[PDB]
């Protein structure tokens, strides 16, 4: 039997290959990204993770982007600058996907965008999924 | 705590606003659509739901598009012509999303596209969410 | 092994007993009217 999974685990676009979209995570209590590759890559593509806060002019519109800080785990060492980053390796096949998520929440808005906008960046897609809702 | 949902419930883009992308539902056992608006509409926008078979010349590539048939529910009636369809009403605000799914699987690939490619259809975004895998 | 690396399926949340409900049933005028009872489908007066 098939289910209406979208009722419980909605999905929102975050990076369609040409533009980024802030995603509101305030109503939910978990989330995670999902990367897909549509063409053969030419070099490693790094990604930056940002978070926003409610604007003063409107309490339902994101403000400017604030870069997410790092959070070292019990094993391993902190990043060179203590800021989160994501790197898609060269070996990713066109018919596979990746998954990763941040350890901490921070503000109620999140976003993701590549470090550099080039032809290699246009070959990637990023999407965000939500866990159970709180309202 | 944050759970990294993307491992268990991957989500894929289906209609970014200017192009339709086939999604391979074969590897999973449930799925569902999710609709979101980015700008106000002017009239109801209908969507067509297809399924694709494996390509004859290459088993790893999707074949031609085939319209999904309707299955009457336990207590209702079939559509005008027995084919599944969806309509996004006018009352939908920008800060809202809609979810729905088909009752039967059919082919291994699925797809969705608007009936028309006018300016209204470009304001909607669609993605597909998958439930636990089987491989 | 930690959350944000392992999937959500490894954690089972607690199940509470309370059932939220916000709907209401407005008070009825029915008890002001005159009360009659008929055991048949038709009546005369």
């Amino acid at each position: 039997m098939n289910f209406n999974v979208g009722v419980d685990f909605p999905s929102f676009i975050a990076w369609d290959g040409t533009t980024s979209f802030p995603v509101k995570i305030d109503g939910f209590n978990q989330f995670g990204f999902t990367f897909k590759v549509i063409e053969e890559l030419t070099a490693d593509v790094p990604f930056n993770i940002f978070y926003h806060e409610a604007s003063e002019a409107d309490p339902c519109v994101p403000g400017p982007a604030i870069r997410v800080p790092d959070v070292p785990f019990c094993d391993g060492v902190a990043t060179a600058d203590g800021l989160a980053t994501v790197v898609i390796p060269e070996a990713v096949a066109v018919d596979s996907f990746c998954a990763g998520s941040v350890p901490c929440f921070n503000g109620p808005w999140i976003s993701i965008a590549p470090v550099t906008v080039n032809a290699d960046s246009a070959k990637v897609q990023v999407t965000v999924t939500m866990k159970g809702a709180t309202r | 705590m944050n759970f990294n949902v993307g491992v268990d419930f991957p989500s894929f883009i289906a209609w970014d606003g200017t192009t339709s992308f086939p999604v391979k539902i074969d590897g999973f056992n449930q799925f569902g659509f999710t609709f979101k608006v980015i700008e106000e509409l002017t009239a109801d926008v209908p969507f067509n739901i297809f399924y694709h078979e494996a390509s004859e010349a290459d088993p790893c590539v999707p074949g031609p598009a085939i319209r999904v048939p309707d299955v009457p529910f336990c207590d209702g009636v079939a559509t005008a012509d027995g084919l599944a369809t969806v309509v996004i009403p006018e009352a939908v605000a920008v800060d809202s999303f809609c979810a729905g799914s088909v009752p039967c699987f059919n082919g291994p690939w699925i797809s969705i596209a608007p009936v028309t490619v006018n300016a209204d259809s470009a304001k909607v975004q669609v993605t597909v969410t998958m439930k636990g895998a089987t491989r | 092994f930690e959350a944000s690396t392992i999937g959500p399926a490894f954690f089972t949340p607690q199940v509470l007993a309370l059932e939220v409900d916000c709907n209401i049933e407005c008070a009825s005028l029915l008890d002001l009217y005159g009360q009659i009872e008929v055991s048949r489908s038709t009546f005369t007066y």
Partner: peptide
């Protein structure tokens, strides 16, 4: 710092890597 998890492929092998068998030993 984030650790990515990736599946080998959506299909086990979209183009199955069917390979020749080892050549037969000498006479």
């Amino acid at each position: 710092m984030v650790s990515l998890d990736c599946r080998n492929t959506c299909a086990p092998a979209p183009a199955s890597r069917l390979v020749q068998p080892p050549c037969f030993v000498c006479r």
